[PDB]
Design a protein around this ligand. Sequence first.
Ligand code: CA
Ligand code: CA
Ligand code: CA
Ligand code: CA
Ligand code: CL
Ligand code: CL
Ligand code: CL
Ligand code: CL
Ligand code: CL
Ligand code: CL
Ligand code: CL
Ligand code: CL
Ligand code: CL
Ligand code: CL
Ligand code: TB
Ligand code: TB
Ligand code: TB
Ligand code: TB
Ligand code: TB
Ligand code: TB
Ligand code: TB
Ligand code: TB
Ligand code: TB
Ligand code: TB
Ligand code: TB
Ligand code: TB
Lengths: 165, 153, 151, 152, 152, 151, 151, 152, 151, 152, 152, 152
Amino acid sequence: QSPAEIASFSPRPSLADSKAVLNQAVADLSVAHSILHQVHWYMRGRGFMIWHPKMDEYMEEIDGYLDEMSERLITLGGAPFSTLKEFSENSQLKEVLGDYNVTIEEQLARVVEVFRYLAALFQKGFDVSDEEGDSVTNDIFNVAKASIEKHIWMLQAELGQAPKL
Amino acid sequence: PSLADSKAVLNQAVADLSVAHSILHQVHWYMRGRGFMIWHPKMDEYMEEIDGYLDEMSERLITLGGAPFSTLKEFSENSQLKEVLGDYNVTIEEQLARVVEVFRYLAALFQKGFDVSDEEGDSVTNDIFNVAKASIEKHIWMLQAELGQAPKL
Amino acid sequence: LADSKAVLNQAVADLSVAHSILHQVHWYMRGRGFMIWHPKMDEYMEEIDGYLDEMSERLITLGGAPFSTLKEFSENSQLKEVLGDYNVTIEEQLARVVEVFRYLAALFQKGFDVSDEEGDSVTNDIFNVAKASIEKHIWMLQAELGQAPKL
Amino acid sequence: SLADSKAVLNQAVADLSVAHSILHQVHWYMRGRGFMIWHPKMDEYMEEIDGYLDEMSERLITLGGAPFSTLKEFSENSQLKEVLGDYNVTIEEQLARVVEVFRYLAALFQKGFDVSDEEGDSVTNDIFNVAKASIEKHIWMLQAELGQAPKL
Amino acid sequence: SLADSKAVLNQAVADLSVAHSILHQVHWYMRGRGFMIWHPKMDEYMEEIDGYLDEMSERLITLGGAPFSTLKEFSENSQLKEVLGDYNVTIEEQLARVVEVFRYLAALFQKGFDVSDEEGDSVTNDIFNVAKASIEKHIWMLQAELGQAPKL
Amino acid sequence: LADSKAVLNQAVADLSVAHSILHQVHWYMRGRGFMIWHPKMDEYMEEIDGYLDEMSERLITLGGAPFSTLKEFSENSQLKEVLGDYNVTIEEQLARVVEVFRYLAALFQKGFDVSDEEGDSVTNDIFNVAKASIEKHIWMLQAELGQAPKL
Amino acid sequence: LADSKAVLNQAVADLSVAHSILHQVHWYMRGRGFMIWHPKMDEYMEEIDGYLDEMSERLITLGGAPFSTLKEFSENSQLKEVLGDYNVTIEEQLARVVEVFRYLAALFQKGFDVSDEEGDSVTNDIFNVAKASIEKHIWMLQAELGQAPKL
Amino acid sequence: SLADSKAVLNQAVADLSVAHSILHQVHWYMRGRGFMIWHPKMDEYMEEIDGYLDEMSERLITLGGAPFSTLKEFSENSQLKEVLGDYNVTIEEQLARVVEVFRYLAALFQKGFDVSDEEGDSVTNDIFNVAKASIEKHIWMLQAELGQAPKL
Amino acid sequence: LADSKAVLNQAVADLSVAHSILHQVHWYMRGRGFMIWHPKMDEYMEEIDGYLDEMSERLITLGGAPFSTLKEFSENSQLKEVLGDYNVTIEEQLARVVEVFRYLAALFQKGFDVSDEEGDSVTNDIFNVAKASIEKHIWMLQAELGQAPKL
Amino acid sequence: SLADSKAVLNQAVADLSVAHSILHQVHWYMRGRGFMIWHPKMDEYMEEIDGYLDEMSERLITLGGAPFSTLKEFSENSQLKEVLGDYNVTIEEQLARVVEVFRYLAALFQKGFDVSDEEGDSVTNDIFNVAKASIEKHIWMLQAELGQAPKL
Amino acid sequence: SLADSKAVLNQAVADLSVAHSILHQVHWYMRGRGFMIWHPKMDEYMEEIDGYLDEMSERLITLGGAPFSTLKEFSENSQLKEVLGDYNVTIEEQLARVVEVFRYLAALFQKGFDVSDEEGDSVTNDIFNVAKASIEKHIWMLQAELGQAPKL
Amino acid sequence: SLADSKAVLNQAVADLSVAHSILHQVHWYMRGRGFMIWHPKMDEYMEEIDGYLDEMSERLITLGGAPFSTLKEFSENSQLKEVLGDYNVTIEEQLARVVEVFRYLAALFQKGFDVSDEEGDSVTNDIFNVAKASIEKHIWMLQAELGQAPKL
Ligand SMILES: [Ca+2]
Ligand SMILES: [Ca+2]
Ligand SMILES: [Ca+2]
Ligand SMILES: [Ca+2]
Ligand SMILES: [Cl-]
Ligand SMILES: [Cl-]
Ligand SMILES: [Cl-]
Ligand SMILES: [Cl-]
Ligand SMILES: [Cl-]
Ligand SMILES: [Cl-]
Ligand SMILES: [Cl-]
Ligand SMILES: [Cl-]
Ligand SMILES: [Cl-]
Ligand SMILES: [Cl-]
Ligand SMILES: [Tb+3]
Ligand SMILES: [Tb+3]
Ligand SMILES: [Tb+3]
Ligand SMILES: [Tb+3]
Ligand SMILES: [Tb+3]
Ligand SMILES: [Tb+3]
Ligand SMILES: [Tb+3]
Ligand SMILES: [Tb+3]
Ligand SMILES: [Tb+3]
Ligand SMILES: [Tb+3]
Ligand SMILES: [Tb+3]
Ligand SMILES: [Tb+3]
């Protein structure tokens, strides 16, 4: 005979170890990137000429974390999500169709939402990596969390609000 | 001459670009209102690009055996663009609206340049207009976006 | 796919999928040649992002609305992604890259054809430049694999 | 013999030190549309202000003087008044505050220009003139953002 | 009010705009041995003319004035005369036109200098001083190519 | 100094005064070594400026309100300023910088301690980076003075 | 694509010979204006070399086999070479570069036409870009020589 | 108090000096397909190694310690063993040798991390961490070229 | 090859042919290693071009008349060219380069010796620097081919 | 009409050439603790002296003058005195010597400033002013190294 | 044939390795006025020494030799002696030690020159020549700091 | 036993200084078609001459010598003779003057080369060789401009 082929529902979704949460990051950072690109492209209104370019800067920073976090996952022996289907299903951020009729304030507020989520994800990754004693991974999350939180201050300040982290 | 018209539209461009530069200088200088700090330096970027086209088009014309307009009287009399005196009381959005309008004219100019030069088989001149049109159109998108509008080319 | 705006948006989806695949090759790569090709994938991706931005933004300039969600990229792209696997050779990785680049070169030909018919010379040149470059890469990638470009 | 020149140099040291402090408060406490342009702009202004403070302090040293060099001295000799940071100053208000400070500095620099000319200190004179040039350009730009004429 | 400082700044705007046009004509129409050096040199002169033009107009704005800003205003106010482009002018003759334009500029800047000195406009006075220094150096140089003394 | 915010604001006050002392040192310096040590103060000042901005901004980020007036810096800082004097020797100037730095090293360790205990990991690493560089500067200044770092 | 491929290879022959002529002009130049024109041949040579590589590599990408020996170059090229001679005037050497450029400009027009007929838009832009630049140079050289470009 | 941290820092000075010797050996004796990529890559590794060895040695000095600083000290104290150069070794063996050196450093740097953590030396702790992060990435890449998992 | 002048001109001829051959290797290359060795042929050609210019120009300085036509290069060179072929393996290409370089080193040695005996120190230095560089390359290429330099 | 401006420019050309010569002696014959920083510093001072000499020489040409241009002219018209190099001179003495030279030049630039101001040559006046500022700053610095006030 | 050229090149590998290690000890153990200038200067020396070390071994490889490549080999073959690091050495003593090292290396490089001169290995000969020129420059400078003649 | 190498090094210091002065005169006094190119070209030559002067003097110092270091010493030991600057001299005459100085220098570097070969001073030999190579290349270029062969 032969070993039976197991048929069960996709197991994961529980952020229990460093590996798990690094992959969740790969997923969320890929979608974040896509949301950022849509804001870049669909943006209209006073303040476009400053924020259009800014989205590029954010995107590059997000790219940087995406790469180092999946590559840390690889180094630790894991297997990073690497298809749009994987990214789209494992991510907790929702995507919507691009729309040109959104005010600047609403765009910036959407980016703050995404940044708040990512900062909590990196907080979770920090805590998990600390508990498991994976100090390298721990530092990666902390660094990413530092600058995301700083971007949240600035965005909120443009919106006339405190960071409210 | 086989290339008489390429020549004529290149020189039209020389005149209109010189006028366009002038207007962008006026916007840069007379600008007042929230957004000054971003748009004032942006006019410099536009001017540098307009300048780059003015030089390239005039010199393509020289290369083809033409005599480019090279006096303010010539630019002025030949250009289809109309200049008005500077006024500090124009709003930032009216200033950007004017820039979009100058740029729309230039896109149509470069379109005609493109067609005429494609007609006469001057493929170098064709490319020059094609590159200029491409850039100007991108600029129109951005300006319109800032104005809360679609590019509407 | 019979106007410039549809071909451009199709390119948005396909370049987005091509970028994802190039990333997968970057990460899962193993074997002799890794030290040269792993970094090369970043060059390829920087380029693909280059075109993605220019095309999407040409569409916008032309009054279109780019695919801008993963669902849209995935469903609209003609490219097929598979799960990442470490157990693929460098030569196999390269061959996959060439397949994708071949697909892109052909998409760029259609964009070239369609915009030429429509008299949209700006879009036409964007497709033209992207093609010249994709084609150069296939020559080089095929050469590493000991084969002619076979365009 | 260069006593009036020395006094105005040192007065500028106090004032520039306070001005720098105010720019730093505006930079941190800024909130509202245009933050993203004006926040970094505050660094540009601070660098320049630091540039003058150092240059003028060292011109004073070079003349045989002794520049104020403590926060107490800066705060007590300066004519500018500082206030507790407040996040609810609007952008426009923040810009108007920088304008008030720059106008003060332009007038201080005028006085320094005049006094150094009177004492025949031509090097000190050109130092104030350069500073004045650039400050007035900044007032022109600030006021333009505010939709106003430079009003020098 | 600095009425004449403003008047000379605006005269400079007009004349530099015409000077710039004249240098462009020389760049384009130039033919003869020396072309390869002087053709590009015309770009360097234009960039410098451009610099003054923007600095002077911007100093005018800063002072409360309203710079000339249309080609008609440039032509009607400039003292410089423009002629149609001709390819049959020699290099030596082109260089002679430039010297003549620059001798004019240097005289204009002397007036700008004298007027701003007199009105106590030291910033403007420096702007003119810097422009005149540069222009006069160029004159020495062009004259030297032409085998002649600067004859300032 | 009740928490992370409190210590951040203390660093804001102390870094401001520390920067002022450094400028005093830069300006009133005389003696053999001037030519190396005078410009070196500029390097120290840029670094202190950097910590000052980063720490105040971390405080902003966290919902605090940084000291931002000279009175506030002066009031809250634990460093004491004295009038400039040209007759201080170069090695005496370097010793005052060492004292100021040892003070800032201590401050930053309290900062590190407090943030660690509160779980403010970003603030923690900020004080740690600051601590590392100051302690290296102490080693180098003490070395110049013929002494061990004596942390 | 036989005709596109043939004109590309022709250009390889002729650009290799043009390059050698420029190198001769560079070395054998004597007369007033040497100091401006001697380095200018280095810029011309650099640019010629860029076309040469670009055009044979295009040919490779198309599945051709570019001429690649001095024999192939001399035999296929329509340019004729003469022994070096220091007795040539500066103006004479410039006229010889003008002649050679006028020739390449014509060849590039053939290449452009042929490629346009065969639908090879990529080769077509390559010829178009080379021709834009050679013609600018001819204007400039002719102007140094007191003449209209006469294209 | 900080004796254990000082001890591991000094161990690292020793092992890093030998490591760097081994990389230089690889660099010079390398032969085979891939020489052209890997030979200069050893240079990257050496300079990164030199970087850690200076940082760590200077952190030891800063703590009041006395770094090993003679070839005899390095050899005696290093746990890494050196062998004679041999051109006959294969590229893949050369790379396997670099991996085994790095796996050792990574383990050493983890010991440093742990020791310094227990002692409260947070600066020393962060130096090992950054070192460890870097080396582990290198092991992944080196293993990748050899067709293997990182096995960390 | 009687004297310094004569060997300088000989090198102009051989360096021209060597550059030709390197370019052939750059273009016709196929197989694993292409991605590192294709661009490596650019660094080599660049270097060869440096020597060729320096050597001919030293000869002009010396009052000679450097070869300046492809006919002179081809007829005077001891190096021999073959038709381009895609079927040559990477290692064969690499070994071709080695053999050209070995010839060049031997030529430069003769150039060194000849200018030495004529007391032309400048020409001597030129051949020395050229030699040291080529031998370094020979070690490196041989290393790739799994062999000792065997000078 | 411009004779005194031309005179003091040409006197500066001579003194600047001798001063360059002196600084090069100091550079070469220097020995003593402090060499490693003061040796390269003399290069910086020489480049600056060179800049003034070229600028002032060329202002003189521009004005229709004829700069001193031989070592014999420089040596004979200079108020500065040269002696044979000697390795025994201490570092303080070397530095005190450069100060004396700088003091002379600063004074010479003051005469130049005065004279051009009288003759209304504002461009020449600015050149002397700029030169004077920088030299006085270096005097402060060298005096400070020497443990002293600038005592301008 | 080239056995003696190879042998001295290999002597150089071992000595430059030990020279580098002594420079590193000097860099780490330095204490005294001058530290902030001389500490970085040891880095520059170390860089230059590595430069020679890599080039000489690679020249050896190129010639068919096998360079020393283990700390054991460097130690055994070097004629330089190493002692434990001591903080209580003065800056002047530390510099005198470098001067001793360099004096040795320049004697070595002269032997390398003469040997290769004899064996007609003109490339190896230029390498030693370049190295010697540079080391002798540094000996002049270090000695000048020490108030001494170069005394080659 | 080193002494003639030192004497040629010192003659070079004198002649290079004089040559630097002559090039400066040509820079300033040049008039005529070609000015715009040859005027800046003199700068390049002067920077190069200063390069040699400094390297040669410092090699002399390194050898335990005492370089000429006053204008009088340069003037009286130089074989080159200076004349009063004159504007009327043609461009072609000026270049010929530089050619004549460069031929003197190449010949002097040849004597330098030979004397240092005989004395076994390889470092100095190499300095003269390098200088000679570049001077000869300039003669070619200058001669080419004047429509002549180099005639070395
Ligand atoms: Ca709405
Ligand atoms: Ca008036
Ligand atoms: Ca005391
Ligand atoms: Ca004459
Ligand atoms: Cl502006
Ligand atoms: Cl990577
Ligand atoms: Cl973009
Ligand atoms: Cl910030
Ligand atoms: Cl041009
Ligand atoms: Cl300073
Ligand atoms: Cl050359
Ligand atoms: Cl290529
Ligand atoms: Cl250090
Ligand atoms: Cl003449
Ligand atoms: Tb990566
Ligand atoms: Tb142009
Ligand atoms: Tb974009
Ligand atoms: Tb300062
Ligand atoms: Tb402006
Ligand atoms: Tb900040
Ligand atoms: Tb290529
Ligand atoms: Tb260090
Ligand atoms: Tb050349
Ligand atoms: Tb000059
Ligand atoms: Tb190496
Ligand atoms: Tb020197």
